[PDB]
Amino acid sequence: NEGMNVKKCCKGFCIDILKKLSRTVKFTYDLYLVTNGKHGKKVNNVWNG
């Protein structure tokens, strides 16, 4: 279970909201992609996703 760091493009309503937030707060942003899960649930008292 070893991958890489391939660079892609993420677009959508959430991306537009994040861009507006960055423009208003005037601070930059670095965004990742979740690989462990989709949303995350408490399993073995450990949060994932």
Question: Could you name the key traits of this structure?
Answer:
Glutamate receptor ionotropic, NMDA 2A; part of a larger assembly; 49 residues; 1 chains; alpha+beta
Largest sheet: 2 strands, antiparallel
Order of helices and strands: HEE
Radius of gyration, in angstroms, nearest whole number: 14 Å
The fraction of residues assigned to DSSP E strands is: 5-15%
**Class by helix and strand content?**
alpha+beta
The end-to-end span amounts to 16 Å
Number of helices: 1
* Total beta strands: 2
- Strand order, largest beta sheet: 1-2
Helix content: 25-40%
What sort of overall outline do the alpha carbons produce when their principal axes are compared?
extended
Structure description:
This protein has 49 residues and is α+β, with helices and mostly antiparallel strands. It contains one helix and two strands. It has one helix at residues 13-25, and strands at residues 42-43, 46-47. Strands 1-2 form a two-stranded antiparallel ribbon. The longest helix has 13 residues, at 13-25. The protein is extended and about 40 Å long. Belongs to the glutamate-gated ion channel (TC 1.A.10.1) family. NR2A/GRIN2A subfamily. This is Glutamate receptor ionotropic, NMDA 2A. It comes from Homo sapiens (Human).
